[PDB]
Amino acid sequence: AGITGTWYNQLGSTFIVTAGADGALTGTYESAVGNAESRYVLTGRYDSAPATDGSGTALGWTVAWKNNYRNAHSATTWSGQYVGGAEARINTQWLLTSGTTEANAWKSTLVGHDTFTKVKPS
Amino acid sequence: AGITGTWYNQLGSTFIVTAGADGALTGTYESAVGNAESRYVLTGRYDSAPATDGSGTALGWTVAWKNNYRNAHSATTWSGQYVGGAEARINTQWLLTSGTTEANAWKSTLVGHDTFTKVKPS
Amino acid sequence: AGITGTWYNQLGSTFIVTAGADGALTGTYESAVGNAESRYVLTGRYDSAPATDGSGTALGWTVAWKNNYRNAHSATTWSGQYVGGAEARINTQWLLTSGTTEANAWKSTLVGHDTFTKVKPS
Amino acid sequence: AGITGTWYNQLGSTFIVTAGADGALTGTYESAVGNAESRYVLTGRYDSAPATDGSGTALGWTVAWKNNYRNAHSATTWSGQYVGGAEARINTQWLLTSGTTEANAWKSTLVGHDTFTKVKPS
Numbered sequence: 001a002g003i004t005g006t007w008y009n010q011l012g013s014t015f016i017v018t019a020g021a022d023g024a025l026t027g028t029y030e031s032a033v034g035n036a037e038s039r040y041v042l043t044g045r046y047d048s049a050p051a052t053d054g055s056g057t058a059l060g061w062t063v064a065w066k067n068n069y070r071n072a073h074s075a076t077t078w079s080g081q082y083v084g085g086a087e088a089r090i091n092t093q094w095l096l097t098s099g100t101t102e103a104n105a106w107k108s109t110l111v112g113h114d115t116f117t118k119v120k121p122s
Numbered sequence: 123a124g125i126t127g128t129w130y131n132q133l134g135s136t137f138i139v140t141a142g143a144d145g146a147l148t149g150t151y152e153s154a155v156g157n158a159e160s161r162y163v164l165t166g167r168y169d170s171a172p173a174t175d176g177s178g179t180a181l182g183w184t185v186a187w188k189n190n191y192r193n194a195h196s197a198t199t200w201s202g203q204y205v206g207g208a209e210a211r212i213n214t215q216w217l218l219t220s221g222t223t224e225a226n227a228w229k230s231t232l233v234g235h236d237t238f239t240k241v242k243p244s
Numbered sequence: 245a246g247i248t249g250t251w252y253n254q255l256g257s258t259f260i261v262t263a264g265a266d267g268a269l270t271g272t273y274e275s276a277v278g279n280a281e282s283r284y285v286l287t288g289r290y291d292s293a294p295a296t297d298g299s300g301t302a303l304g305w306t307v308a309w310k311n312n313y314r315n316a317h318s319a320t321t322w323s324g325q326y327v328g329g330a331e332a333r334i335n336t337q338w339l340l341t342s343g344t345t346e347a348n349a350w351k352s353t354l355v356g357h358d359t360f361t362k363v364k365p366s
Numbered sequence: 367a368g369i370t371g372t373w374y375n376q377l378g379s380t381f382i383v384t385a386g387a388d389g390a391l392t393g394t395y396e397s398a399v400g401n402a403e404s405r406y407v408l409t410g411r412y413d414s415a416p417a418t419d420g421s422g423t424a425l426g427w428t429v430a431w432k433n434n435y436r437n438a439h440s441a442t443t444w445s446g447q448y449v450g451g452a453e454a455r456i457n458t459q460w461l462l463t464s465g466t467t468e469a470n471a472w473k474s475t476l477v478g479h480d481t482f483t484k485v486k487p488s
């Protein structure tokens with residue numbers, strides 16, 4: 001129900017996460033897009049004692065897009081909240097920074113928004 | 123990698139990180155004051171095999187603003203790049219999401235930027 | 245070409261825009277559908293010679309949240325693209341900056357996304 | 367109000383703006399060679415009656431990157447605040463959306479931050 005489980009964004013990427021009792025997020029991410037193949041390590045944190053007033057649960061995680069197969073020389077962070085609901089979801093915005101020369105730094109960082117559910121889109 | 127150690131942002135904050143051999147970032151984020159109550163766990167990832175063309179090293183990390191003392195029901199992610207050389211820096215953009223109700227989700231996420239140096243501001 | 249007219253977001257706001265031949269966007273943003281004291285000037289720019297390759301038409305606009313009735317001492321910019329066809333959309337990300345003191349400048353800017361359609365909901 | 371004038375960002379782009387009595391911003395933005403080919407129309411909005419408590423003045427503007435010479439099929443919005451006096455600055459964050467196909471929309475938008483002053487960067 002909660003955060004631990006297998007989630008998918010609107011692009012069909014797969015987010016496999018475990019929420020630890022200590023506030024840790026660990027798991028793997030597999031992207032449906034970009035210069036990516038197979039699973040990447042993720043790590044992050046979440047509020048392990050959220051408000052009880054109907055607010056969502058704040059969280060964030062990072063993937064650096066290097067694994068044993070490929071290296072895109074970039075990293076994404078997702079910042080968002082888990083929303084317990086009929087259909088649970090994690091609503092995020094993200095920042096994807098590529099390593100760049102200093103002259104190209106102004107154009108280093110993409111921004112977007114991903115919504116995760118436990119079902120893959122159709 | 124150049125990353126392990128203590129970094130300071132432009133507003134006082136301090137973080138101490140270990141860059142592990144296969145891409146992990148682990149450490150703590152705190153205030154200039156350095157009191158324990160201001161200290162929070164951080165975890166993230168970085169490119170452990172960056173390009174050799176003078177490009178920066180992509181990284182990101184998360185802090186959930188809960189520790190043993192306090193809970194802001196929110197998390198920050200920093201996404202950016204480490205720029206080495208004579209005056210090394212970590213240049214970041216960040217997203218701070220607070221847990222909200224759905225009606226308030228429009229006011230859930232702050233955005234900004236932080237630059238970290240190895241020496242304290244001023 | 246397809247932009248001019250009335251758009252609805254997913255949360256109860258409207259706007260009416262004219263896309264001029266010179267790349268101008270002008271109109272009115274009504275934050276609460278039906279409420280006249282909730283109408284604000286919008287101004288922006290769009291690509292007046294977009295590609296005809298399946299790509300969206302890039303655009304942006306600003307609303308400063310002051311009118312004759314109210315003033316939130318803030319302004320939103322929406323940056324995005326218009327997607328035509330039978331189910332036309334304007335997909336945006338936005339930045340909402342409030343005037344703050346320097347001390348509070350870290351908390352000045354909210355980020356989010358909205359999607360506008362031509363049907364109120366269809 | 368303090369806003370009308372010639373501003374420069376940290377990259378040396380030149381923002382020539384007029385703040386009209388009604389909340390309008392109008393002018394030109396150029397990236398920096400002084401050349402016509404590099405100059406683009408901007409429009410935006412600002413809070414024409416800011417708070418009197420020390421807070422900055424909220425504002426935003428858009429440039430679509432089409433002129434008589436070039437067309438990048440993209441647009442940037444800047445959202446920020448003017449901070450008056452000894453000396454004046456406009457602090458912004460920006461969103462740069464390029465037209466994309468639907469499949470590529472996740473990579474449509476860059477994010478960054480620009481600070482403008484009435485002097486060139488040194």
Ligand SMILES: COC(=O)c1cccc(-c2cc3c(=O)[nH]ccc3o2)c1
Pocket residue numbers: 009011013031032033034035036065072073074075076094096097098112114472
């Ligand atoms: C510089 O390298 C890239 O641009 C890159 C490489 C591999 C994957 C991705 C990727 C996947 C993904 C996603 O599922 N949601 C949000 C961002 C996002 O980004 C990006």
Ligand SMILES: COC(=O)c1cccc(-c2cc3c(=O)[nH]ccc3o2)c1
Pocket residue numbers: 131135187194195196198216218220234236
């Ligand atoms: C609702 O806010 C909080 O719970 C809280 C508490 C303590 C620190 C912060 C904080 C520090 C910091 C930083 O150095 N750069 C970027 C964002 C950011 O946020 C936020």
Ligand SMILES: COC(=O)c1cccc(-c2cc3c(=O)[nH]ccc3o2)c1
Pocket residue numbers: 375377379397431438440442460462464478480
């Ligand atoms: C696709 O992009 C372009 O074709 C293009 C052309 C000329 C200038 C720019 C430009 C200048 C500038 C700046 O000063 N601050 C923030 C963003 C930004 O973008 C972009």
